[PDB]
């Protein structure tokens, strides 16, 4: 048939189908024998059940084992002693006291990208790598052999997540990631300072401590995960504001507009569409009946868009209340999303900084159309933009 979901790059093909999916069909196994949840309150029943719904992806994924530190695919009751330890170090004041750092990379780079530039090669790629490398006080830049988020998840091919053969070639992107990390921890524990790495290494709750191998794997997940979402969504923020470019002049007349333009491109295109879990035993969503050990595939981009969770919920309107709101663009229930506080201050700060400079930016198609990323994430792997106004115009 029609046996697994579209691509994420044709959007509003993957939406339309999303939309049917949830009114005929709104628990459905794909050939893989993987299962998909398209709404919203589903959704949540998914993440919120950590018994039952597992963070591990390695128990359906053969010869595969769980690696220490990495956070976010871990369950309780090591989750909860892993995220207490971790937060005593990624903390609040740690991410605040960043905004002036962020603010004059920021700066800088746009100041020298003239008025037709990458967003991504120039800003939205380099500002969360350089910010997050100087959190755990790694050398300037990582201009070494580690390589590129964009290009794995170009290149790797990730259909079926069962697949031993793709947890393989993740790992082998990853451990020399990993293995440049632990030296850094092994470094740190020599000699600490008070950069997140060393305060990683001095972190204990409840006599509980991280070896080098679990900081190293929370480090490189703390390290990917910040980038390739903030990138994306630095990318999807300037994407929506230029299909309703009105928004430019009104955030410009008040920049305090401009968190709330963050979350509703947040709430709009997630950059991470779909979080994956894995059933511990027989369960049922939405009365359709879910075997053990089956991965299930919970779709935010579903629930983000489901009308009965968000009135006219295909309208970019910054100004919606969602009253008292959660932001499900970064999860739901013990894994919500550690590095939301820096996400929402680094992207402010971009918006703030773009806007101060040049007034606004259109993406241009003069060459291309752009290239989408096909899996994964929702977001282009480049975006050309022009600036109409700024700085360098003269008489
Ligand atoms: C807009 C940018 C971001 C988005 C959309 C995002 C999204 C998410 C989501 C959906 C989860 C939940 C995963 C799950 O339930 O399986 C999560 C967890 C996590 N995020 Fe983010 N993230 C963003 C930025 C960041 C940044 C900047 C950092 C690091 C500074 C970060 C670090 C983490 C970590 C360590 C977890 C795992 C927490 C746990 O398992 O307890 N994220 N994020």
């Not at 120039?122 to 830049?141: D, K, R």
């Amino acid at each position: 048939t029609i046996d697994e979901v579209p691509g994420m790059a044709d959007e509003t093909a993957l939406l339309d189908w999303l939309g049917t999916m949830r009114e005929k069909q709104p628990v459905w196994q794909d050939r893989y024998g993987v299962w998909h949840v398209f709404r919203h309150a589903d959704v949540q029943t998914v993440l919120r059940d950590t018994a039952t719904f597992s963070s591990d992806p390695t128990r359906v994924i053969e010869g595969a084992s769980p690696t220490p530190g990495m956070i976010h695919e871990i369950d309780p009751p090591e989750h909860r002693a892993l995220r207490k330890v971790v937060s005593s170090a990624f903390t609040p004041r740690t991410i605040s006291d960043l905004e002036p750092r962020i603010r004059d990379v920021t700066r800088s780079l746009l100041a020298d990208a003239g008025e037709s530039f990458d967003l991504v090669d120039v800003l939205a790629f380099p500002l969360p790598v350089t910010i997050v490398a100087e959190l755990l006080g790694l050398p300037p830049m990582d201009h070494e052999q580690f390589g590129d988020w964009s290009g794995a998840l170009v290149d790797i091919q990730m259909d079926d997540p069962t697949d031993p053969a793709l947890a393989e070639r993740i790992a082998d992107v990853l451990n020399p990631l990993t293995a440049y990390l632990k030296a850094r921890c092994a470094e740190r524990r020599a000699d600490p300072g008070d950069d997140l790495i060393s305060r990683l290494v001095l972190a204990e709750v409840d006599g509980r401590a991280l070896d080098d191998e679990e900081a190293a794997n929370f480090s490189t997940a703390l390290l990917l995960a910040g980038h390739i979402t903030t990138t994306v969504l630095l990318g999807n923020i300037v994407r929506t504001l230029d299909e309703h470019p009105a928004h430019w002049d009104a955030a410009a007349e008040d920049p305090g507009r401009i968190p709330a333009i963050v979350e509703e491109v947040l709430r709009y295109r997630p950059p991470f569409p779909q979080m994956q879990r894995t059933t511990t035993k027989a369960t049922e969503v939405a009365g359709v009946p879910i075997p053990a050990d089956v991965m299930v595939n919970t779709w935010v981009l579903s629930a983000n868009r489901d009308s009965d969770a968000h009135d006219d919920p295909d309208r970019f309107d910054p100004s919606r209340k969602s009253g008292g709101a959660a932001q499900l663009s970064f999860g739901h229930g013990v894994h919500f999303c550690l590095g939301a506080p820096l996400a929402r201050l680094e992207n402010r700060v971009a918006l703030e900084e773009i806007i101060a400079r040049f007034g606004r930016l259109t993406v241009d198609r003069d060459d291309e159309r752009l290239r989408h990323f096909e899996q994964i994430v929702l977001g282009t792997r480049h975006l050309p933009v022009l600036a109409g106004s700024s700085p360098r115009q003269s008489a």
